[PDB]
Structure formats: C-alpha cells, structure tokens
Amino acid sequence: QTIQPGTGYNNGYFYSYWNDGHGGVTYTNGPGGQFSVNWSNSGNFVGGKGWQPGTKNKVINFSGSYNPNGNSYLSVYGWSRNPLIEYYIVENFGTYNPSTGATKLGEVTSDGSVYDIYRTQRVNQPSIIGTATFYQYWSVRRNHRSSGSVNTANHFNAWAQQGLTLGTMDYQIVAVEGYFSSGSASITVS
C-alpha cells in the first residue's frame, strides 16, 4: 500500500521509506519484495525493501524497472554499528555520480563488473543512533544495470582490505534515492 514515511515489515521484507518533507514522492509497498516509487519535482527521499537485520554474506537479487529523470540512484544500502558506517553498493544512477567528492580507495570486481570504492566522512549528521560522525562507504558499479545479483561479501571483503571493519549489521535494503528530480521505479528484492 501507499504509505507515509516509516519502517516495518511487509510481505516478508523489511522496508524503510524516508523523505525530507518536500512533497512530490509516492512510495508504495507491493507484493513480496516489491516496492514502487513515483516522483515528480521531489525533494530528497530514500525508499526500499530488504532485511532487518542484514548480514555480511547476503546475496541480494533485484529486478524491475528503474527510470530516473534526473538526480537519483539505485543501490544496496545499509548501516553498521561499532563501527557506525553508512554504506552504498550503487548499481545504477541518473545524471549525477553519487561518489562525486568522495575519496577513491580502490577497485573490486563483483557480479560482472568492476566497482570503484570511495569513502567520505559525515560530521554531526543524522544516523541510526542519532547525531553522530561516521564514514560513508561506496562501491559504484561501472556497468549500470537495473536487475541482477549483488554478492555483498565481495564488497565487505574489499572494504576490509582497505581498512574498514564492519561490526554489527543493521538494516540492509535495495533502495531508490531521489534528489530534487522526477522518475519512476518498480523493484523486486529477493
């Protein structure tokens, strides 16, 4: 069903939907691991389905249609505590590369493509434990796609070789983020 921002479980899957209050975004939970997002001249939002808690060796499958009209990205997104880390395994993006401004650490090959690895610090920013300072880790896929499988272990292992040691995994979802743009997406996670 179409819902306002919140979190919970739907048809077997955890979901999280958040927006900045701007307006112009419609998020709907669908059958199984499906979610749909339609937006038009939106603000900043993030929505998707997955697991709570996630794991360090989950193989995530996703398929569907991803049609951004401007700034937006499709990625595996989640958090870790001890250390506090916000991470992204970006599979596709619109007009803006989300890693712009982040520091490149290295590269990793996974699921049919090379990914560029970056990291950036967020100081006194909102987080799953409140206002805090933490790193944001990014794996950005070179060959964009809207369906496939992501072996998260390959990314966590590569990040560990670069010095990141994830601790307790919090939620882990396939998410569509939008940033003052328009678009539509219907994604099914499994």
Resolution as reported, in Å? 1.5
Annotated catalytic residue: which of 154, 164, 177, 189? Answer: 177
Question: Which technique?
Answer: X-ray
CA distance 160 to 128: 22
Neighbours of 45 (CB within 10 A): 24
Could you tell me how far CA 118 lies from the centroid of its own chain?
A: 15
Length of the chain: 190
Residue 137 known to bind ligand:
no
Residue 17 known to bind ligand:
no
CA distance 73 to 52: 21
User: Starting at the edge strand that comes first in sequence, how are the strands of the sheet with 59-69 ordered?
Assistant: 25-29, 34-39, 182-189, 59-69, 148-151
* Residue 183 CB burial class (10 angstroms; 0-12, 13-18, ≥19): buried
> Has 86 been annotated as catalytic?
yes
CA distance 85 to 109: 22
With contact defined as beta carbons under 8 Å apart, do 168 and 81 qualify? yes
Output DSSP code: residue 2: B
Helix H or strand E segment including 75: strand 72-81
The type of residue at 85 is I
Annotated catalytic residue: which of 86, 91, 116, 170? Answer: 86
CA distance 173 to 190: 10
Q: Choose which CATH entry (3.40.50.720, 2.60.120.180, 3.40.470.10, 1.10.287.3510) describes domain 2-190.
A: 2.60.120.180
Residue 121 known to bind ligand:
no
> Has 177 been annotated as catalytic?
yes
Q: How far is CA 184 from CA 10, 24, 51, 87, 157, in A?
A: 20, 12, 23, 23, 33
Neighbours of 56 (CB within 10 A): 15
CA distance 175 to 44: 13
The type of residue at 47 is G
